[PDB]
Symmetry: C2
Subunit: 401 residues, 2 copies
């Protein structure tokens, strides 16, 4: 089952969460983690917000103290593994033996092929190195172009506007946050950013660029001092593909984190896994998944009687004055709206239902409602839809009653 020594590839949140849980659960054998970035392990969400704005990396490091006696090989790239020999080949010339190999290599931003041979600054925002580069360009009154409608770009947009940067945004879809966001939320978020001065361009695609100007598929132009591309990510599953594991933009795993290769597991952004609400396999790119899937896989490795990963998906996004939380599915056969949807002091809750059962929820600036809604969601609650809409209802009381 759990055979020593343990080797983990990748040193992001999923990896740290996994190795801390192994130790906490009682595994005392060797643990070695291989991390290609030459950085003390760190959390990524601040890179679009407080770090981008204030620049102190020592406020964003992950706490590894619950993971004693781990050798962290930082600035080292795993180049291949041999699943018959049970070895991993490292970029520094060394080889590591393993009893159990864990792939926690995350995902990397997709490049924009139309900006391939561009001669103006084009960045993505994934690493501390990216953030530092971008941050050095957030000069007040500079012109920033964001490509893509996802949350990371929108988080950057808010930070940039607060810094006095002019921000334009190009989105191929008809709405922002096309993945895992109710349309009601997406529409409101566009209204918010527009009111904050973001110049939004929907159903546009970047066709190329010429001397400091971006070209679009409608035949028009946008001039920018910098482009930040955020059109999604691709799983870092190359080692798994080469070694013969089942992969398709992500390594397929079950609820125990098992790949198709014996003694090899995977967790975090690199995985394609079952979403219990949809019953379909998806690559879940959330902070909560990285942490919770890592913990669950470790727990079951040390104690095989433990259940497999069972958590329902959720995330947050902090976009200026909007503290957004979203759980479960974006839609069902019914949406209930609690509160008014307004740019004047935004505060509201959405609830998605499917045949009476809660299958998703959204809170904007309403954290107190989010936790009980996640509990109701987890057990597939079917509350009175009238009470759910009635603003005199206490959802926290409901999650108990």
């Amino acid at each position: 089952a759990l055979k020593a020594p343990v080797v983990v590839l990748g040193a992001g949140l999923a990896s740290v969460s996994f190795v801390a849980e192994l130790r906490q659960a009682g595994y005392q054998g060797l643990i070695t983690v291989v991390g290609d970035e030459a950085e003390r392990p760190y959390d990524r969400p601040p890179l679009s917000k407080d770090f981008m704005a204030h620049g102190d990396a020592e406020k964003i490091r992950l706490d590894c103290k619950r993971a004693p006696e781990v050798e962290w090989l930082l600035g080292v790239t795993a180049q291949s593994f041999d699943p018959q020999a049970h070895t991993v080949a490292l970029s520094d010339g060394r080889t590591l033996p393993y009893g159990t190999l864990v792939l926690a290599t995350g995902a990397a931003p997709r490049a924009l092929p139309t900006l391939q041979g561009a001669t103006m600054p084009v960045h993505t925002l994934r690493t501390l190195e990216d953030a530092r580069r971008i941050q050095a360009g957030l000069r007040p009154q500079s012109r920033l172009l964001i490509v893509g409608g996802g949350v990371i770009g929108l988080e950057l947009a808010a930070t940039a506007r607060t810094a006095g940067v002019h921000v334009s945004l190009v989105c191929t879809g008809p709405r922002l946050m096309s993945r895992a966001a109710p349309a009601t939320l997406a529409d409101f978020v566009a209204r918010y950013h527009a009111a904050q001065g973001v110049d939004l361009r929907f159903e546009r695609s970047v066709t190329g660029s010429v001397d400091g100007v971006v070209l679009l598929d409608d035949g028009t132009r946008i001039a920018a001092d910098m482009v930040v591309v955020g059109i999604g990510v691709l799983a870092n599953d190359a080692l798994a593909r080469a070694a013969g594991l089942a992969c398709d933009d992500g390594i397929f795993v079950d609820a125990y984190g098992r790949t198709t290769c014996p003694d090899v597991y995977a967790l975090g952004d690199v995985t394609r896994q079952r979403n219990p609400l949809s019953g379909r396999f998806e690559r879940i790119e959330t902070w909560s998944n990285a942490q919770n899937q890592g913990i669950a896989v470790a727990r079951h490795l040390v104690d095989p009687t433990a259940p497999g990963y069972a958590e329902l998906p959720w995330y947050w996004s902090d976009q200026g004055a909007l503290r957004i939380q979203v759980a479960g599915l974006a839609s069902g056969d019914e949406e209930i709206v609690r509160g008014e949807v307004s740019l004047d002091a935004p505060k509201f809750t959405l609830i998605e239902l499917q045949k009476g059962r809660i299958v998703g929820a959204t809170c904007v600036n309403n954290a107190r409602d989010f936790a009980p809604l996640r509990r109701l969601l987890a057990v597939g609650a079917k509350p009175d839809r009238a009470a759910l809409a009635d603003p005199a209802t206490d959802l926290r009381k409901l999650a108990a009653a």
Copy 2:
């Protein structure tokens, strides 16, 4: 690796192909096959053609002679397996131990929820039992309604017309054969069936039925003496799901046939696997996949130095006067047409290219061209597009030259 005893669940083409290859490759340990149908193992393609027309099941049995010393438990359903205990629970009360478990349980026709409580004859066409039931209703001048635009229904359509049965067909898509068929082929096939008297209804959905009449989403009616539903299939992956394997309408496997559960493999229609041409995971529902994936998985189990499954997808469909063969992808950036596309003595070849490389081919009544085209496809050939179109070109010579 290959640990005895071997137990296979399912006794269709994939299973038979797998067990014959184990024996041929030199494995002499126990093999037990569990098959829920109480039938000598048989091939399914004749069920829409020669069997449906002529009714002799002893002309469609699979040859199991290359699989000596196998116990076939026919008419027995595997109800669960315990992958820790390495046992399988059978419907007759017995339990089988395994060293290696192989899931070859295929797929079952999707039902039409709108015909759920229908009171007129509604069948699917998958088993010998189905075929016998349907065949007993192919009375000349009866009215048959086929639901779905796939090849099995179209094969039945031809057989029924030859028997003097009136045939109508309802298809939710704008074209027949929407999966894995070039549009040029799909359009021609519709022309053929229409000319043979099939009453085709495109972009229609069945909404229900009342006393011998089918209702559609355009608000209209079709009266039929029998409905045969062929709107696709769903993988029979329930045992795998219950036992904790990674599944999503099909069991995920790699090129060795490995599932996410150690000592458990899967092959055939039940699997979701990599299509090397698209590089994506798909459930491949072809006869050639069932046979060739089964052989490849068995070969590598007995001889681990053998390569994994590497075959590119292809199928045939016999639809009256049209002997159709299709390999690879339905489209690329270019289609080359060899010959005329005509209802007068149909004979033509299509070639699909992507940046000069052949990625797919179709032959209609042109078998001699199909084999060399499959060879060109397999090595990603990039022939002169002018020669490919030039009817004086010999493709067989090309596959060598």
